[PDB]
Write a protein that binds this ligand. Sequence first.
Ligand SMILES: Cn1nc(-c2cnc(N)c(-n3cc(C(N)=O)cn3)n2)nc1C1(c2ccccc2)CC1
Length: 820
Amino acid sequence: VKKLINSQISLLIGKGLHEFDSLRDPEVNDFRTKMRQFCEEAAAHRQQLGWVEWLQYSFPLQLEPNRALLVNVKFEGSEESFTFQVSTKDMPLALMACALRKKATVFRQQPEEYALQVNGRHEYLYGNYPLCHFQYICSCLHSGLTPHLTMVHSSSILAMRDEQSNLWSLEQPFSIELIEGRKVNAMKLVVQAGLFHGNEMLCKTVSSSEVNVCPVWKQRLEFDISVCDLPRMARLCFALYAVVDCPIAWANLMLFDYKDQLKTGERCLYMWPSVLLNPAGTVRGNPNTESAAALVIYLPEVAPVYFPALEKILELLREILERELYEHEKDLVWKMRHEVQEHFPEALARLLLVTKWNKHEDVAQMLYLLCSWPELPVLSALELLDFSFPDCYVGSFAIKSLRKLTDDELFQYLLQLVQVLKYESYLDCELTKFLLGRALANRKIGHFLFWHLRSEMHVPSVALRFGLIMEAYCRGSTHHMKVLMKQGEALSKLKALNDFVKVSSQKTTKPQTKEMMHMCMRQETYMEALSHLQSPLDPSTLLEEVCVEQCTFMDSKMKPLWIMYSSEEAGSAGNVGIIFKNGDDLRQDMLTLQMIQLMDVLWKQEGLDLRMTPYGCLPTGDRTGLIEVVLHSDTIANIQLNKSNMAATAAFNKDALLNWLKSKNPGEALDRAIEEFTLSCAGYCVATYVLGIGDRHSDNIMIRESGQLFHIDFGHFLGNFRVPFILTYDFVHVIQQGKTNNSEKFERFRGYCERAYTILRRHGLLFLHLFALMRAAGLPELSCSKDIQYLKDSLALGKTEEEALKHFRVKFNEALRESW
Ligand SMILES: Cn1nc(-c2cnc(N)c(-n3cc(C(N)=O)cn3)n2)nc1C1(c2ccccc2)CC1
């Protein structure tokens, strides 16, 4: 009973629960007990919610940030359906009233007792919102398809909820005895030590004696800082290197434990391999104790000393700079700390950075202001999550201010908040409790929290923390654990299938590999594992019956799988596809697509719809992930191949794109396609310029039959090969309706580029704060400040709106001149 759950969690999280116990770590055991109770209490609160509130948990509303339409409606236990001519301005309730009235006339005799289910999807339409505010309806309006809904009664939803139940005295300087090492390298060994509070030094780094490569030291290392001046989040950072400089390894550790006790005495530090000091690095040792170089040290006893409780802490030209500052400016800000709190609360981040964290008096003064500091906007609170603000009280304050995040905003920044877990010092933290509580209150948040954590289980520095969080999540969600295992079983089968395809593609022809891929898929174990799951890309998308005949693979290096699905209940909306990719890291593609999706959110919040294609991309495992198939689309290169006997037969290369559009959009449909092409082109022109996406060719640009242009394969961003704006002749030709000269259409296009750009510029700090939190990911192209700088230049944030739009025209006209 409880035994099967534990063995289900182990298989699902990818780590045995026994491994947690084998550690004999009271920090681990205390996380597990406290979080289990927390997560079980979150599960209990859920079983007592109202049926609409339960819908808000399991099926949160997929909303969008007058005119009539046909809508098909049916009731749960019947095939009989009714089609109505409703208005987009109508609310679900009015639609539910019509359906109950038409059922009353047919069946010969209350709308608040029902909810509208999207046929063959894990999506519902409810709440006081007009129909055109729903994403599914909007998808059905832009394409032209008929929405299909099922009237679900309150008791049927309640049946779902039920079958888914579970001190200052120490004035002496800080010192450490550096005992000995046990490493490998070709020279002498120096052990550089240092004390840090986040990204900054609490004193100057102290080095060890040059001991030969053939190691013993037994050397006292004293730091220029008093033991009573040690901030609660003080970090001792070591670096072992070879010299005649060659780095060998690194290790960090917190001076206080999870129970606030200043650590004593002997410690063996299992070092991590080096690429010199790494304060941002994990404060947990290398779990590969058999091959890791170790540093044995001694924490001299000062006697049990604890960090003082909050009661003890609480007991103990300005405007022209507030928009990188000199020593005198820092002193000014500190003296005026009371003015900052009262008249500039949003400048807290700038005041936290000027405070002397190496002086216990200065810290307590700042902490007394923080304890009475007013709640900050989400935008400011996001800056406070950075490794640049390590203090636990500052971290707690950031969470307190982030509690007002809507489930939509939290979902948009979820990727960033999971990376911040990597900067954390202890297992039990406010961010974890926050993430878990929000995940257990929203099944879509929970789904993506799981997948962001599961995708990093093969990374030894996060495996313990991520495995512990996932376990606690499962305790508060036994039914979801089973749903996610079904996803893991399919992904496990797709891995084996892709391994076969890789082998078979080197030994025979594609029609032979495809047929045996099909033969492998038609096996019962594969038919069952690959069918009837929630999509890991989107839990509201149901991947029902696998369409073997339609399944294939791509010709690229890793031979990615093309898996098609169909759903009788969903009709046409159930015709969905997934791309299984194994061999490449999908983290950067995901980040890039999330950033484009954010841009689209921001343009839509300003009334601008640039017709973007925000398709799913999700890393699931070690160099493994999924991509959502965008159907009725092709690469520009494929359309430009000019294949014979087709409807897009072109005399000139320039005509191929427009000829393809004309064949997919005949008559009055053509003008609509050109508008879609132009809007989406402006969006991706701005997005790729702002994000610095280079290596753009006809093979990584796609078009939908609707005319919408989109980008694939984001292997390089932030100018990593200063990329210019890009305008292609083939595109300009389509924008200009197949005419050589058309200033009317081109100046409108230039306006879309101008507008899209200035909108992003106003939210330029949002992009900067999100990319700075993403530095914790370890993406080779987002590792330092020079990566962040690219965004600052492309957005021209250190300029005025009038001066930035001029600089954009300079770059736009350069791209138009390069266009043949
Ligand atoms: C018809 N079609 N549709 C797509 C498509 C649709 N939706 C996407 N999201 C997408 N993405 C590709 C990547 C990537 N990084 O490879 C990412 N997204 N590709 N690709 C094809 C082609 C093709 C399919 C299947 C077999 C051979 C060839 C190439 C004709």
